[PDB]
Every structure is written in C-alpha cells, then in structure tokens.
Write a protein that binds this ligand. Structure first.
Ligand SMILES: [Zn+2]
Ligand SMILES: [Zn+2]
Ligand SMILES: [Zn+2]
Length: 95
C-alpha cells in the first residue's frame, strides 16, 4: 500500500459539482477566484479558499476532519494530515 490513507478514504467529485466550485466563488465567504479550493470528500461538497485568502479550506478541514482539499485553479490535491500535496487516481480496479 504505497498511498496516503486520508485521501485513499475520500472519493471523487463529478464535473458538474466541480464546475460550480471552479466558477471562482467561496461557499463560506465572497473572495472570488482565482485560487480557490474545494473539499475532496466525495460525501462533502463545500467550497473554501486557502491561506491565500482566509484558509477556509483549513478551518473546514478541521471542523469536518476533512484533510483533503483540491484547488480548482490547478486541479491539484492537498493533504493536511500528511502535510503535503497528493494526487488522486482516475481509475483503481479493486472491485
Ligand atoms: Zn472563503
Ligand atoms: Zn468537507
Ligand atoms: Zn495523508
């Protein structure tokens, strides 16, 4: 198992949901993109901004223990628990 558990637990969001988050707007405040983050938790669908604005992604991460956040600006995933950037595979193949 050469992968992070935090992210390995969360799923993936559809383009439909990401499209709204990619619009460049925070679900908590009104900072307006670019540079916006979105909860990677397949079960969660919240839009927050990183430390570059109000670190909403961090706060939300603690509140819901969601240490997975992906910036819609570069389409990159980040792991708070691991304390680094991670990548989300498109296809697994377990079941
Ligand atoms: Zn915000
Ligand atoms: Zn969340
Ligand atoms: Zn991790």
């Amino acid at each position: 198992r050469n992968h992070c558990p935090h992210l390995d637990s969360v799923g993936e969001i559809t383009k439909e949901d990401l499209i709204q988050k990619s619009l460049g707007t925070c679900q908590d405040c009104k900072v307006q993109g670019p540079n916006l983050w979105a909860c990677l938790e397949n079960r969660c669908s919240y839009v927050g901004c990183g430390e570059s604005q109000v670190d909403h992604s961090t706060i939300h991460s603690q509140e819901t223990k969601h240490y997975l956040t992906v910036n819609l600006t570069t389409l990159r995933v980040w792991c708070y628990a691991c304390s680094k950037e991670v990548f989300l595979d498109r296809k697994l193949g377990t079941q």
